[PDB]
Ligand binder design. Structure first.
Ligand code: TFX
Ligand code: TFX
Ligand code: TFX
Lengths: 100, 99
């Protein structure tokens, strides 16, 4: 079927509290074809030790996938998600918007 | 960097004609990820199948399982049809009852 471009959402598991351990998630949804690269970024730099869900799909072959890592937020630190996919020219970055 | 799937077909318990079992097609070790899988009662594509999710290694080798509840009979015969890029022609694999 026809190509389609991922929806990308970045969120913490519990609400932020500086210096308290949390998890950071990057949820990539709705996309096709399946092949995709995902990386999480502490101040523009690629976190080593990340974990991920399996890659699941609908009857209509939309794919869904989750990346996450334990982390401790601080006032100075800035976190984001870098996705590359065919439907993206340029690897797309999306910031973690704290204030929600 | 391409890799062709390993394909294994097996029942969960040993065959017993007219007793309910599960049939699995396990497709392993493959890349890239895109792949079609179907199970076949006498060459015909079974409607109501289930599947695991698609998991992968650090290596980006992918792993996936299809299965269905079924009742085997002496004359019935079952198989798995996989299509992948690395295959010229969709590959079929039989279920050997005497696994
Ligand atoms: C079925 C299910 C289970 C969990 C679950 C969802 C759906 S959807 C979701 C979630 C998605 C996005 C966000 N942010 C972008 C703030 C926060 C939470 N969770 C955590
Ligand atoms: C319409 C439709 C069909 C299937 C389907 C969805 C939507 S959304 C989804 C899904 C699967 C796994 C995950 N995580 C790994 C947490 C999150 C979402 N599935 C499996
Ligand atoms: C009755 C009977 C006899 C042999 C037999 C089975 C049932 S089920 C089975 C088997 C084959 C492959 C796998 N994996 C690759 C996960 C798991 C189990 N064997 C080898």
């Amino acid at each position: 079927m026809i190509q389609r471009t991922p929806k990308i959402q970045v969120y913490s598991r519990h609400p932020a509290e500086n210096g308290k351990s949390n998890f950071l998630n990057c949820y990539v949804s709705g996309f096709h074809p399946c092949d995709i690269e995902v990386d999480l970024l502490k101040n523009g730099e690629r976190i080593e030790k990340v974990e991920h869900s399996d890659l699941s799909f609908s009857k209509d072959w939309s794919f869904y996938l989750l990346y996450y890592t334990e982390f401790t937020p601080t006032e100075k630190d800035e976190y984001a998600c870098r996705v590359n996919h065919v439907t993206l020219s340029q690897p797309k970055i999306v910031k973690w918007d704290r204030d929600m």
